[PDB]
Design a protein around this motif. Sequence first.
Motif, PDB file in Angstrom:
ATOM      1  N   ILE A  55       0.818  -1.215   0.000  1.00 23.96           N
ATOM      2  CA  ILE A  55       0.000   0.000   0.000  1.00 23.96           C
ATOM      3  C   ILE A  55       0.852   1.266   0.000  1.00 23.96           C
ATOM      4  O   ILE A  55       0.533   2.222  -0.722  1.00 23.96           O
ATOM      5  N   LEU A  58       2.185   1.549  -3.387  1.00 19.98           N
ATOM      6  CA  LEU A  58       1.138   1.950  -4.322  1.00 19.98           C
ATOM      7  C   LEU A  58       0.803   3.417  -4.135  1.00 19.98           C
ATOM      8  O   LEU A  58       0.509   4.116  -5.112  1.00 19.98           O
ATOM      9  N   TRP A  59       0.779   3.867  -2.875  1.00 15.78           N
ATOM     10  CA  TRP A  59       0.533   5.269  -2.555  1.00 15.78           C
ATOM     11  C   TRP A  59       1.574   6.168  -3.207  1.00 15.78           C
ATOM     12  O   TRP A  59       1.234   7.179  -3.832  1.00 15.78           O
ATOM     13  N   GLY A  62       0.983   6.064  -6.613  1.00 15.08           N
ATOM     14  CA  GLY A  62      -0.130   6.944  -6.910  1.00 15.08           C
ATOM     15  C   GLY A  62       0.332   8.385  -6.858  1.00 15.08           C
ATOM     16  O   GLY A  62      -0.164   9.245  -7.591  1.00 15.08           O
ATOM     17  N   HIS A  66       0.044   9.921 -10.996  1.00 10.10           N
ATOM     18  CA  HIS A  66      -0.753  11.115 -11.244  1.00 10.10           C
ATOM     19  C   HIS A  66       0.077  12.355 -11.564  1.00 10.10           C
ATOM     20  O   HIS A  66      -0.396  13.210 -12.323  1.00 10.10           O
ATOM     21  N   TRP A  69       1.284  11.968 -15.279  1.00  2.59           N
ATOM     22  CA  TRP A  69       0.184  12.058 -16.231  1.00  2.59           C
ATOM     23  C   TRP A  69      -0.519  13.418 -16.219  1.00  2.59           C
ATOM     24  O   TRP A  69      -0.793  13.980 -17.283  1.00  2.59           O
ATOM     25  N   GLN A  70      -0.807  13.974 -15.041  1.00  3.19           N
ATOM     26  CA  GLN A  70      -1.569  15.221 -15.012  1.00  3.19           C
ATOM     27  C   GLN A  70      -0.878  16.393 -14.326  1.00  3.19           C
ATOM     28  O   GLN A  70      -1.477  17.469 -14.240  1.00  3.19           O
ATOM     29  N   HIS A  88      -3.222  16.578  -9.193  1.00  5.07           N
ATOM     30  CA  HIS A  88      -3.988  15.769 -10.138  1.00  5.07           C
ATOM     31  C   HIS A  88      -5.193  16.576 -10.603  1.00  5.07           C
ATOM     32  O   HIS A  88      -5.523  17.627 -10.047  1.00  5.07           O
ATOM     33  N   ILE A  90      -9.234  17.427 -11.707  1.00  2.15           N
ATOM     34  CA  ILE A  90     -10.496  17.466 -10.987  1.00  2.15           C
ATOM     35  C   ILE A  90     -11.563  16.935 -11.933  1.00  2.15           C
ATOM     36  O   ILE A  90     -11.861  17.560 -12.958  1.00  2.15           O
ATOM     37  N   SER A  91     -12.129  15.777 -11.609  1.00  2.00           N
ATOM     38  CA  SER A  91     -13.199  15.199 -12.424  1.00  2.00           C
ATOM     39  C   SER A  91     -14.380  14.946 -11.492  1.00  2.00           C
ATOM     40  O   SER A  91     -14.594  13.825 -11.023  1.00  2.00           O
ATOM     41  N   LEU A 142       4.599  -0.672  -8.921  1.00  2.00           N
ATOM     42  CA  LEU A 142       3.491  -1.578  -9.187  1.00  2.00           C
ATOM     43  C   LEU A 142       3.955  -3.019  -9.120  1.00  2.00           C
ATOM     44  O   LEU A 142       3.239  -3.872  -8.584  1.00  2.00           O
TER      45      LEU A 142
ATOM     46  N   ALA C   9       0.439   1.104 -18.374  1.00  2.00           N
ATOM     47  CA  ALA C   9       0.358   1.186 -16.923  1.00  2.00           C
ATOM     48  C   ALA C   9      -0.871   0.459 -16.398  1.00  2.00           C
ATOM     49  O   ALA C   9      -0.801  -0.240 -15.381  1.00  2.00           O
ATOM     50  N   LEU C  10      -2.004   0.606 -17.084  1.00  2.00           N
ATOM     51  CA  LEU C  10      -3.225  -0.029 -16.614  1.00  2.00           C
ATOM     52  C   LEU C  10      -3.238  -1.516 -16.930  1.00  2.00           C
ATOM     53  O   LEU C  10      -4.052  -2.255 -16.371  1.00  2.00           O
TER      54      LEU C  10
ATOM     55  N   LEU G   6     -14.378   6.853 -15.747  1.00  2.00           N
ATOM     56  CA  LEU G   6     -13.715   6.094 -14.691  1.00  2.00           C
ATOM     57  C   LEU G   6     -14.218   6.451 -13.299  1.00  2.00           C
ATOM     58  O   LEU G   6     -14.422   5.555 -12.471  1.00  2.00           O
TER      59      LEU G   6
HETATM   60  C1  CLA Z   1      -2.834   4.285  -4.681  1.00  2.00           C
HETATM   61  C2  CLA Z   1      -3.026   5.590  -4.678  1.00  2.00           C
HETATM   62  C3  CLA Z   1      -3.931   6.296  -5.624  1.00  2.00           C
HETATM   63  C4  CLA Z   1      -4.980   7.281  -5.279  1.00  2.00           C
HETATM   64  C5  CLA Z   1      -5.360   7.807  -3.923  1.00  2.00           C
HETATM   65  C6  CLA Z   1      -5.497   7.651  -6.623  1.00  2.00           C
HETATM   66  C7  CLA Z   1      -6.617   8.578  -6.804  1.00  2.00           C
HETATM   67  C8  CLA Z   1      -7.265   8.859  -7.932  1.00  2.00           C
HETATM   68  N1  CLA Z   1      -7.033   8.379  -9.153  1.00  2.00           N
HETATM   69 MG1  CLA Z   1      -5.424   7.162  -9.618  1.00  2.00          MG
HETATM   70  N2  CLA Z   1      -4.198   5.612 -10.185  1.00  2.00           N
HETATM   71  C9  CLA Z   1      -3.285   5.068  -9.361  1.00  2.00           C
HETATM   72  C10 CLA Z   1      -3.174   5.291  -7.912  1.00  2.00           C
HETATM   73  C11 CLA Z   1      -4.001   6.207  -7.114  1.00  2.00           C
HETATM   74  N3  CLA Z   1      -4.958   6.981  -7.641  1.00  2.00           N
HETATM   75  C12 CLA Z   1      -2.297   4.179 -10.017  1.00  2.00           C
HETATM   76  C13 CLA Z   1      -1.168   3.418  -9.386  1.00  2.00           C
HETATM   77  C14 CLA Z   1      -2.733   4.187 -11.427  1.00  2.00           C
HETATM   78  C15 CLA Z   1      -2.147   3.480 -12.623  1.00  2.00           C
HETATM   79  C16 CLA Z   1      -2.674   2.064 -12.557  1.00  2.00           C
HETATM   80  C17 CLA Z   1      -3.913   5.085 -11.399  1.00  2.00           C
HETATM   81  C18 CLA Z   1      -4.546   5.366 -12.700  1.00  2.00           C
HETATM   82  C19 CLA Z   1      -5.621   6.350 -12.761  1.00  2.00           C
HETATM   83  C20 CLA Z   1      -6.390   6.713 -13.974  1.00  2.00           C
HETATM   84  C21 CLA Z   1      -6.331   6.389 -15.437  1.00  2.00           C
HETATM   85  C22 CLA Z   1      -7.323   7.705 -13.392  1.00  2.00           C
HETATM   86  C23 CLA Z   1      -7.077   7.752 -12.032  1.00  2.00           C
HETATM   87  C24 CLA Z   1      -8.001   8.682 -11.376  1.00  2.00           C
HETATM   88  C25 CLA Z   1      -7.910   8.943  -9.902  1.00  2.00           C
HETATM   89  C26 CLA Z   1      -8.885   9.875  -9.226  1.00  2.00           C
HETATM   90  C27 CLA Z   1     -10.332   9.356  -9.150  1.00  2.00           C
HETATM   91  C28 CLA Z   1     -10.616   7.908  -8.719  1.00  2.00           C
HETATM   92  C29 CLA Z   1     -10.329   6.873  -9.793  1.00  2.00           C
HETATM   93  O1  CLA Z   1     -10.942   6.881 -10.850  1.00  2.00           O
HETATM   94  O2  CLA Z   1      -9.308   5.861  -9.583  1.00  2.00           O
HETATM   95  C30 CLA Z   1      -9.027   4.910 -10.606  1.00  2.00           C
HETATM   96  C31 CLA Z   1      -7.821   4.102 -10.189  1.00  2.00           C
HETATM   97  C32 CLA Z   1      -7.173   3.266 -11.016  1.00  2.00           C
HETATM   98  C33 CLA Z   1      -7.621   3.106 -12.438  1.00  2.00           C
HETATM   99  C34 CLA Z   1      -5.983   2.477 -10.518  1.00  2.00           C
HETATM  100  C35 CLA Z   1      -5.766   2.567  -9.013  1.00  2.00           C
HETATM  101  C36 CLA Z   1      -4.699   1.584  -8.551  1.00  2.00           C
HETATM  102  C37 CLA Z   1      -4.346   1.821  -7.084  1.00  2.00           C
HETATM  103  C38 CLA Z   1      -2.986   1.242  -6.720  1.00  2.00           C
HETATM  104  C39 CLA Z   1      -5.460   1.287  -6.193  1.00  2.00           C
HETATM  105  C40 CLA Z   1      -5.289   1.693  -4.735  1.00  2.00           C
HETATM  106  C41 CLA Z   1      -6.531   1.268  -3.967  1.00  2.00           C
HETATM  107  C42 CLA Z   1      -6.555   1.647  -2.493  1.00  2.00           C
HETATM  108  C43 CLA Z   1      -5.370   1.069  -1.728  1.00  2.00           C
HETATM  109  C44 CLA Z   1      -7.880   1.130  -1.949  1.00  2.00           C
HETATM  110  C45 CLA Z   1      -8.144   1.493  -0.494  1.00  2.00           C
HETATM  111  C46 CLA Z   1      -9.647   1.485  -0.221  1.00  2.00           C
HETATM  112  C47 CLA Z   1     -10.233   0.092   0.003  1.00  2.00           C
HETATM  113  C48 CLA Z   1      -9.348  -0.793   0.876  1.00  2.00           C
HETATM  114  C49 CLA Z   1     -11.609   0.203   0.642  1.00  2.00           C
HETATM  115  C50 CLA Z   1      -8.364   9.855  -7.807  1.00  2.00           C
HETATM  116  C51 CLA Z   1      -7.737  11.207  -7.489  1.00  2.00           C
HETATM  117  C52 CLA Z   1      -8.854   9.287 -12.436  1.00  2.00           C
HETATM  118  C53 CLA Z   1      -8.443  10.717 -12.550  1.00  2.00           C
HETATM  119  O3  CLA Z   1      -7.301  11.018 -12.851  1.00  2.00           O
HETATM  120  O4  CLA Z   1      -9.418  11.751 -12.257  1.00  2.00           O
HETATM  121  C54 CLA Z   1      -9.055  13.124 -12.317  1.00  2.00           C
HETATM  122  C55 CLA Z   1      -8.449   8.621 -13.687  1.00  2.00           C
HETATM  123  O5  CLA Z   1      -8.952   8.835 -14.847  1.00  2.00           O
HETATM  124  N4  CLA Z   1      -6.057   6.955 -11.541  1.00  2.00           N
END
Ligand code: CLA
Lengths: 706, 139, 29, 128, 80, 161, 30, 107
Positions: A55, A58-59, A62, A66, A69-70, A88, A90-91, A142, C9-10, G6
């Motif tokens: 975690i 991943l944080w 994260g 972000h 990318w943004q 990051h 705002i959506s 990752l 990445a995804l 998303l």
């Molecule tokens: C781990 C920390 C972390 C945090 C707090 C965020 C937060 C956010 N992401 Mg990001 N994201 C992350 C990691 C993170 N991300 C990683 C590692 C990737 C590449 C795989 C992405 C790829 C990504 C995309 C393409 C987009 C976002 C977006 C967003 C925003 C909206 C929610 C969403 O659609 O998530 C979607 C999340 C994913 C597709 C992947 C998340 C993978 C992480 C590692 C999961 C972590 C889960 C967490 C530990 C769960 C705890 C709660 C649970 C135990 C109850 C939000 C600010 C959206 C945005 O930018 O809006 C402006 C958006 O379009 N994220």
Amino acid sequence: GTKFPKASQALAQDPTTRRIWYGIATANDFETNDGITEENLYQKIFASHFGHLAIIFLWTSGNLFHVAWQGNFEQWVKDPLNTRPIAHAISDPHFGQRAIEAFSQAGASSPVNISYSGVYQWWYTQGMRTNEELYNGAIFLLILSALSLFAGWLHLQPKFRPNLSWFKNAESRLNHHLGGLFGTSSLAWTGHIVHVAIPESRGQHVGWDNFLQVAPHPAGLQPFFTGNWGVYTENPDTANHVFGSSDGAGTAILTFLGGFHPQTQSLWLTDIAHHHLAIAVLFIVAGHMYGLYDTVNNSLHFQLGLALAALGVITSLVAQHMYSIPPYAYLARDFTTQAALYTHHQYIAGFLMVGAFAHGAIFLVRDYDAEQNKNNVLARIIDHKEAIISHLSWVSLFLGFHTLGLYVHNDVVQAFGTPEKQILIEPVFAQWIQSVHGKSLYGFEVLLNNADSITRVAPGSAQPIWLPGWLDAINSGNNSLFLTIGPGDFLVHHAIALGLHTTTLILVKGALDARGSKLMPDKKDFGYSFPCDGPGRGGTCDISAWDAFYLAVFWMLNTIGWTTFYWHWKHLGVWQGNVAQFNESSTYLMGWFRDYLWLNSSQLINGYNPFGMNNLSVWAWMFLFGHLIWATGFMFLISWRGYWQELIETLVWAHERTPLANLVRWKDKPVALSIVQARLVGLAHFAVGYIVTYAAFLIASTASKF
Amino acid sequence: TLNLNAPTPIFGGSTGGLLRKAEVEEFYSITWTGKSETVFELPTGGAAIMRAGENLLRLARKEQCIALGAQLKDKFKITDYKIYRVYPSGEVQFLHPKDGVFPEKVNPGRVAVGSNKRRIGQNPDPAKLKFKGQETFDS
Amino acid sequence: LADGQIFTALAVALVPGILALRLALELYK
Amino acid sequence: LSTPISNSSAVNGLLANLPAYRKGLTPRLRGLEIGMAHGYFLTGPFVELGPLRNTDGGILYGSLSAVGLVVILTACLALYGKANFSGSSKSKDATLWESGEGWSDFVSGWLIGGAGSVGFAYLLLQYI
Amino acid sequence: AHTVKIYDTCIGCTQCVRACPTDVLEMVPWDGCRANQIASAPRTEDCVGCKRCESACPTDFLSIRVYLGAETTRSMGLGY
Amino acid sequence: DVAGLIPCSQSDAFERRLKNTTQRLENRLKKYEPGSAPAEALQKQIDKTQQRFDKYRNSGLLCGADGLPHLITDGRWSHAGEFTIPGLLFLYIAGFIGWSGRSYLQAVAASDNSTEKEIIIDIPVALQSVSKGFVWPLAALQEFSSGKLTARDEEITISPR
Amino acid sequence: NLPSILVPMVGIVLPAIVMALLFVYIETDE
Amino acid sequence: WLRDFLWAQASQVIQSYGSALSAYGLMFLGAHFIWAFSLMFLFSGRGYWQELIESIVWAHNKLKFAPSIQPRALSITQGRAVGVAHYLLGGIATTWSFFHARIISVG
Ligand code: CLA
Ligand code: CLA
Ligand code: CLA
Ligand code: CLA
Ligand code: CLA
Ligand code: CLA
Ligand SMILES: CC1=C(/C=C/C(C)=C/C=C/C(C)=C\C=C\C=C(C)\C=C\C=C(C)\C=C\C2=C(C)CCCC2(C)C)C(C)(C)CCC1
Ligand SMILES: CC1=C(C/C=C(\C)CCC[C@H](C)CCC[C@H](C)CCCC(C)C)C(=O)c2ccccc2C1=O
Ligand code: SF4
Ligand code: SF4
Ligand code: SF4
């Protein structure tokens, strides 16, 4: 008699709503799982640690994905002094036209956040220059998170499940971590500074495509084996050098310049590298050396309770040393970012220190054995146990009556038009120490204000070369390196001491009274967290060891709050170059009300209004949001279980007697939250509210005026 | 034996009584012989009227049956209150008095269950029972 | 950045996506 | 609780003759008239008060929100099926709502009746 | 259900038994003298854990102690 | 000049506060009748302020850049008059009432209603503990050296372990 | 075109299932 | 309610030191104190404190004058009662000066 919750067998037979709540509250509380054994416990811990490890990675991934990318790091590196780092995008579908118009800021066209975590200033210093170098770290983390996940799964499989003896080998773990975890990592980080960070700060690009080719120093590794370490003391950077580029760049990789870089106002990269290389050596040597040891090894709470006690200590240090010694370029100049990092880490330090004593009390109830702990150091604090609390109780009383007394004294005489009658005590013992450290402002004229003392000269081996850079910085008032103090700083420092003394007393008493007192001799038989002992014997509310931790969480927030309140107000004047406002008003409490809370809330509270809105509407909304959830905690803390349970009964009756609704029924019988539950739920609202009120104000007040 | 049916008092009311807990599991029935036609406070609301009786009242908790008869002891001296627990939708008939005489009076033939042969100052610490299914106050 | 690097990445995020589904089941087991 | 509107003939007519208390109807059809009733007015709030009302497009998007709550309410009607009827445990009465006995089509009789209401009620305000 | 233990420091005052609001306790003959009596707990399934019992013991450090345990319909005091 | 502090005789902003308070009272005095009881209250409020400024100008105090006198405690005997002699003046009288309660309670607790004379306190023994309180720093030295200022830990109520 | 789908999946659609799975896990028995 | 009313009108009582309206500024400050002083009694319970006096009566039994009046805690209803009676002591007196100073100046 349901299957849920698995880990608590007793809860599973509870037919009411309490089952679900407590089934969450006792889930990761492994020590009371049904049919558990010691060997399964340890193997489960190890795997659970990997999940946390994943975690954090991943944080930070994260935090990396972000930004690449943004964010605007590539745009940021070019001229950091005016570009706002983007967290990051705002959506949020509920935004209107005028809210998009306000948060499309920091030179972005779509709405985004202005980041305040300081990752941009940290990553720059480390050698990152483009968004694609950012993109590599997130992808790498990752895999490392999935590799930690696989490893956790791996060490749970039969063929790879460790034995008990491996987990309890304490001395080997210290040896291997100060060898590996500490030793090898710190030395390598010096290497990453000299092989990557330093070239990029001097305009030279070093990447994976070339790192094996370009050496960090013109003719390095021939003096290394021959002992000629002095070659790395070649030409450093000149005072005219522009960070990140080669106009004034040197070639040194190891130095001892001291002070701060004149442009960035932060530490020298070469200075950071030598420090880590030196500390590394210290840990590797100490890591090759290997009745209380038989007690600190059998209690997981004792180890953790010291591990938080170690974590709590070094978390406070991180806050104190990062504001006075800025290590990242321009991080001294991003004042909101200076403000968030200090407050955040100081609150964390308060939780760990409080937590250290909390898990210590758990140790005393479930693991402390009076007959395997006799005539040792531990049981000898329990000997004069009533003495320690009684003296500690007095000092708190002593500190409080007089510290509040001086503030109120000043307030009244100031209220009556006579500021000259205030009691202002100079912090002469403190002003001694800065003068002993070289600050010639107070003029005490001994110890490196003494120009001839053996400390400043060092006639032993001509070592002391941190001294020129340091003396320049300690006399210039352009930083926070040993800030000027007056009467205001005196009073608060004794208030903080009062805060540290009252917070420590309850936590030590809570652990020391966990096993028993005269009012409750057999407390240990009921476990750590139980409601009370009824209205008999005069009344027993808040008698459990858990309740002591609970009351102390209120005191720490007040204490850590007062520290952050002090640090914040003081810094406002220095960043606005008018330290005089603070110096005279901080010695009475109305000043903290007029010039700190009311004054700095002008913009924050106007984030939106009947005339429009600005980019502070979130912080303005959050500020109000925080006030509401803070106040919501008061509800659970003041009104107790009985009132609610009787109220719920009329609702149960009404539902069952209402046609078209009678037809449907709850699966879990509704009941009010428990007595202990309410304290925790109330405190959680209170504490979240405490922070999200302070987080909203701190960030918004500074981001509008700078 | 509960001898159901028996005359219920002349009551007519109580929103605060006997909802859908009862018909699925575990409701109650107090029985006494009231030596007047007095008025008395119920636990649900308060007034019903005691009969000459064979008095009987179907309550919801064993708690509610006890605080009724303590009033029958204090305010009306009715010593004959005989509480129960019903058939199939209840569990064990005639809980009190379980031994024919009053539980404040001592009866031999009862079993000293929960009787402990130690003090509580002589209580062990849980470290001597740690990671074990023995409970810190058991015997 | 680009558009394609986002989806690579995804695609590599499913490699944490199956093990946490397994490890939390394994931590339950 | 015996006086007077729990006991009146004006309510005991109306209570019994609704399709949750009516005897003759079937769970696909008594979940239908229940579904047809609650779904029909649910377009009412959104087409008058929504996120956007002064648009084309206020009745389209208002009715599109209206079927949005319904598809959550099929899930809530099935999660009262998946929780209260776990193993299809009977009780002392066993009507449609006591034990299940018709619940697998009752969740869809709402879906036919509720989304069939907003498909009906869209052409009254926006059209005709 | 809750656990109700009765220790041998009982002075046979019978106050505890008459303090219990759900009649969980009763007096039984003590065998160390055949003149003392000690309380006994045949109906621990009805203990709500109110602790009214423990308040009635006069002895300096109570002989009956109630340690709250697993909750059930009876112990939570639900009318529903 | 202990921390760069300049004395209040040559503190320029400290003598500025005296030109700032009576001028506010002069604005309060220009509008009134200068023989009224407001004006005899307005000539007093200048002069009660004045001798306070001529107390701290003359004391050799160290005023700051605010123009306000500060207090120094590392205790030297140049700045002993800030803290030391006003501080031990507390300490002497604190042990007076401290040796009131230390001495009142040992006799009265050896009585029949030992607690009503904590409610209805006897005017004999209290004024004796006024006289017994004056010998407080001397009397407790033969208490502790004999040991009767403390006890042994087998006499004191002590929480279980 | 990426967050506009998303965020109403993770914030809306995802809790509609992961609380639905954690409704049939809290309220089922062996 | 916070910006246009509470922030705007709290000005008159915090710019009032050195005035004839100055005890209003003190009671506005002084009643913010006692309100928070309630929460020491309200959010807490008895059995912490009556356990804590075991330590404080130890300091007077170590020196052999622990009083015949046994120093006790408050009862649970009392800790509620003191806590509310100081709560209303603050929030009314906070407004009492806040209403006084604001309407004297601009009203
Ligand atoms: C781990 C920390 C972390 C945090 C707090 C965020 C937060 C956010 N992401 Mg990001 N994201 C992350 C990691 C993170 N991300 C990683 C590692 C990737 C590449 C795989 C992405 C790829 C990504 C995309 C393409 C987009 C976002 C977006 C967003 C925003 C909206 C929610 C969403 O659609 O998530 C979607 C999340 C994913 C597709 C992947 C998340 C993978 C992480 C590692 C999961 C972590 C889960 C967490 C530990 C769960 C705890 C709660 C649970 C135990 C109850 C939000 C600010 C959206 C945005 O930018 O809006 C402006 C958006 O379009 N994220
Ligand atoms: C008057 C007799 C008396 C004496 C000789 C002591 C002595 C002591 N107290 Mg105790 N105490 C007392 C009464 C007394 N106490 C009363 C009445 C209270 C309730 C206010 C307390 C509450 C208290 C607390 C909370 C603490 C002590 C502590 C102490 C010890 C440290 C000294 C100190 O700082 O006191 C503390 C002083 C105060 C709390 C303020 C003054 C107390 C009252 C107001 C004095 C009133 C005197 C009375 C009017 C005289 C009656 C006149 C008559 C005899 C002729 C010392 C052994 C401390 C300790 O534990 O040290 C290890 C500590 O933490 N005391
Ligand atoms: C007893 C409670 C107490 C506590 C917990 C502290 C704690 C602190 N003081 Mg403070 N201080 C105190 C009492 C206390 N002080 C007293 C009574 C005075 C004299 C008025 C001061 C004057 C003072 C100054 C000028 C400074 C501090 C500073 C500090 C901080 C750093 C440590 C230090 O320099 O200690 C110094 C050690 C002491 C002052 C001795 C400990 C206090 C003893 C126990 C008090 C006994 C009083 C005594 C009986 C009175 C008799 C007077 C007579 C002999 C003339 C630390 C928070 C410094 C600071 O602010 O750093 C940022 C600083 O510059 N203190
Ligand atoms: C003490 C707190 C408490 C808790 C945690 C629970 C928990 C539960 N109750 Mg119980 N219950 C309680 C007390 C409690 N109950 C009380 C005081 C009553 C009244 C006497 C009930 C009466 C009751 C009944 C009749 C039922 C439950 C049920 C449930 C279960 C499902 C949750 C639910 O149905 O909520 C429902 C949520 C609400 C009522 C909130 C209102 C929601 C409004 C309409 C807005 C939400 C719409 C919006 C579009 C949200 C969509 C989000 C999505 C897009 C992501 C859950 C275990 C169900 C159950 O046990 O199934 C067998 C059930 O049928 N409860
Ligand atoms: C609680 C007070 C309250 C009220 C009345 C409203 C009302 C509204 N909100 Mg707001 N809002 C609120 C608080 C409230 N909000 C809160 C607490 C938040 C979160 C912080 C929000 C966040 C929010 C957002 C983001 C948005 C709204 C929007 C709206 C509008 C459309 C909502 C809608 O169509 O629902 C549909 C209504 C229903 C499904 C049913 C309504 C209740 C029915 C009529 C009760 C029937 C009972 C009946 C009369 C009695 C029995 C009948 C008998 C014959 C048997 C509407 C004006 C939207 C808007 O743009 O505003 C203009 C929108 O985008 N709200
Ligand atoms: C965190 C995730 C999240 C997201 C992405 C949204 C997104 C939205 N909310 Mg919000 N909302 C949330 C959490 C969230 N909400 C929470 C936690 C609360 C409680 C505080 C609210 C309270 C709230 C209210 C009161 C309202 C909204 C509304 C809206 C919508 C405004 C624009 C619109 O409808 O355009 C116009 C487009 C349409 C009207 C077509 C609507 C399409 C619907 C939503 C789905 C149709 C069914 C679909 C085909 C299949 C199911 C998808 C569905 C589950 C998403 C937008 C979709 C408003 C709304 O319109 O409600 C529907 C509204 O009135 N929200
Ligand atoms: C010098 C100085 C200072 C300091 C001080 C200090 C540091 C002190 C401390 C103190 C100490 C370090 C001491 C010791 C102590 C200890 C103990 C141990 C105590 C005890 C006490 C007692 C025992 C008491 C008694 C009594 C009396 C006397 C009377 C009444 C009664 C009684 C009993 C209470 C200052 C800066 C401020 C100022 C300047 C100078
Ligand atoms: C602090 C606290 C206490 C301890 C505080 C107590 C016992 C009050 C002690 C202070 C009073 C004001 C002392 C009385 C002062 C003497 C009468 C002084 C006499 C001197 C004469 C000159 C008048 C509780 O007892 C308590 C109980 C229940 C819930 C919360 C709490 C709680 O928070
Ligand atoms: S309910 Fe609260 S006040 Fe009452 S006995 Fe229990 S803990 Fe004490
Ligand atoms: S309550 Fe305690 S002392 Fe009284 S009879 Fe029962 S066991 Fe004996
Ligand atoms: S725990 Fe409560 S119900 Fe059980 S015997 Fe004691 S007082 Fe009676």
